[PDB]
Symmetry: C3
């Protein structure tokens, strides 16, 4: 009945409890909250980091993770399956639900159409047909990353209350168009936590889907923080406490990534470097990984003592354990 | 020494004991029958369902399953390995046998020749060279499915004795020629259990290999049931207690599936629907999965309360645990 | 801090202790030396045998192995990652190091250049950036195989002291050029153990890289054994106690394997057979596997009671457990 599809679906108190359980697990990693239980990790797209953290997380709590990497499933109802689909998600979710206690789902968008991708069909289908809790391991939003990220910020600042912090979610250069998942999640969680958020991107075409812009706005009101869109690098970084980098192809160009290649390439200066970081208030830098060094961020920034990307990546483990424990 | 290659190899009392242990495991899933033991699940062909049930089954009994998906093995003796084969099954089975306590084998036929496929070389080779019990996870017969299927029928009818039940194994439409494995197993187990069996198919060309027809006949005599081949849909369904659907390419066409495409396509009416099911004696419907909705069976039949396909799929878990426990 | 990259890095006393712990584990396989611990098995190249032994080894000691098969990683520093690499080994090793207690690495050479391959970049990179012990699961040397091999010899001869034994590392025919890893390791460990070693190959072009020739020489001096290069089959086998076969492409031909195909094909007589084995002092035969029957060794030699290849393969399990236990 209760799933962990997006943090936006959980009340603030529930998210706070998850973060605290995550901190507790970080102090005592071995437990029995999942003793004799199991989780099916269904990866429609490969991920070494996510597979490792979840698999180990289940093991450490006495459970077992079954890793499934399909590779042809039909999600549409009343559809004559005479095509290339062998079985309907109805049967898949229901069968797995007779075996495991939880189901994790990872499904990256096709990038051939944001119009379709934004529907989150794969995840919504599992959540609808599954008799057991479903966990978003990343589709168009990365909720587990949000919490790992948030925990890392709380540990860094020495407090659970992040209000008053200047948070800068900056777009970054990449030779190819990327998913907005991490970006959408970053906006969601930074505002939900009540920080002064600024979405820094090259042009208005890079502004995130309305769904998330509304989420952020709605969260600003609840948390007492602030939101703001910007296109000026130097002013955005100024006096910033946190800088989060993430690359993503402008939504208005989904389907054809040819005329955009020259557009993104003229913005290879949005790379986070010491010059920019020095403008902040001794702010910290982080990225969700994988990160292309000297493209999204310079080797100097990465190896800096202000980069907490490795801590954030570690926290995926502790945060995902808190989620699995809450759902069982 | 003792393997679980086919149910036909086990006495009726042993099969009854397996089914009962399976029911016991269904009531108490956690156990120690495999404590510290392991099973190697060798999949020459991918299977999410079979991998999940076996892996979880080993975990629940205190054991560990190692999943191996090759992808070049030689099974022929005295064959100069100067071809594309790197190692002989002799070495593979013997080495794995020094590591694990049980070996599961899944190997779908090549469909390029039923003449060769019917030899069950992969399975027979493992059973011959392996120092530990071998388990058929599906090749040309699906013995684990047979028991999962049989258990589901016993639970549905509220009794272990299925004698007197009208069982209809019906062929079903599919855009492509399929393996007869599930069909051969269905005939084997339905007759072994003593039911009034009817093999419903379009033309005599779809009759199953003699090996299984003889098995069925031999089982009818032992169980006190009956066997019968039919080509009339309405008469077959009439007063039926159980309807099992399965698609499969006529054996006489193995090698060339071109002139058969038009032959099978003219029989897309063999699809199980409410019209047919209504003719039975409030009979139950089931399929081994994966099932193409609105092709092999209509969405109406699938979502009906008489469809026990999800229960049968669940039982793969309990039945496979009974098998692993009996073999160690 | 301490890794298991090559046996040559460990003192003789440490190697002796590993071999003894391995013998102890062979007598009592279940233990708690890895209770609650985990190892990441990173396979850049597939290996059923190595995956099975390590995974089971972790399970038997109360731990858990996470299997990762990438398939695009950058190992070069200060390299603008605008190519086909998504993330730097720096981030990979560091993140995995926050999750698991040990990291195993398997990476076969590209064969496109021994000049580059001999650098052991993949392994050295992991060992440099990883915060936890790294284990060579085979790159250009196969140290786990060395110990499995050595243990099998000690069990066969009924003593830990192998000094005085005539060891013949023979090159063998193969339709394609192979890695020297196993060959380099065989020379290393046979000399380190103090045996009378003879490297039997067709022509001086097949002599192993200087690195290992020096290693052997340096080991002969320490162990009191002997080294010797030979090109005469009959004289090499004569009075031999141990015969180890392994195929490998001459190092001087790395990059272009066309003019070598005809060169290796004229030496298909280097195959180990009863005629040759009969010349030894009732010597034992072994191979690391996979082995092409009737090409590297005849079916007669393989099925002989003097072939200890299956025992050596089994010992990978016990030896790898000793290594994992020593590193944690």
């Amino acid at each position: 009945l209760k799933h962990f599809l997006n943090t936006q679906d959980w009340s603030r108190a529930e998210l706070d409890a998850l973060l605290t359980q995550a901190a507790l697990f970080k102090r005592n990693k071995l437990g029995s909250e999942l003793k004799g239980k199991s989780i099916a990790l269904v990866f429609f797209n490969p991920s070494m980091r996510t597979r490792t953290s979840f698999e180990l997380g289940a093991f450490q709590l006495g459970g077992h993770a079954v890793v499934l990497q399909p590779g042809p499933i039909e999600f549409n109802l009343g559809t004559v399956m005479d095509g290339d689909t062998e079985e309907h998600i109805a049967e898949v979710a229901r069968v797995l639900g007779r075996y495991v206690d939880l189901i994790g789902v990872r499904a990256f968008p096709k990038f051939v159409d944001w119009s379709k991708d934004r529907e989150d069909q794969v995840l919504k289908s599992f959540a609808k047909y599954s008799p057991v809790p479903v966990i978003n391991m990343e589709t168009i939003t990365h909720p587990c990353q949000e919490l790992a990220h948030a925990l890392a910020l709380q540990e860094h600042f020495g407090t659970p209350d992040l209000r008053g912090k200047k948070y800068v979610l900056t777009w970054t250069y990449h030779p190819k168009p990327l998913n907005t998942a991490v970006a959408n999640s970053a906006l969601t969680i930074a505002t939900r936590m009540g920080m002064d958020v600024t979405l820094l991107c090259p042009t208005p075409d890079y502004i995130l889907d309305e769904r998330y812009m509304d989420w952020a706005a709605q969260n600003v009101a609840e948390s007492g923080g602030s939101l703001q869109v910007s296109h000026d690098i130097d002013s955005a970084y100024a006096g910033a406490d946190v800088v989060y980098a993430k690359s993503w192809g402008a939504l208005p160009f989904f389907g054809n990534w040819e005329p955009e290649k020259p557009i993104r390439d003229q913005y290879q200066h949005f790379i986070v470097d010491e010059r920019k970081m020095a403008l902040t208030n001794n702010g910290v830098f982080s990225h969700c990984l994988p990160l292309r060094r000297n493209v999204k961020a310079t080797d100097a920034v990465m190896d800096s003592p202000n980069c907490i990307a490795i801590d954030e990546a570690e926290n995926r483990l502790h945060v995902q354990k808190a989620i699995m424990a809450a759902l069982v």
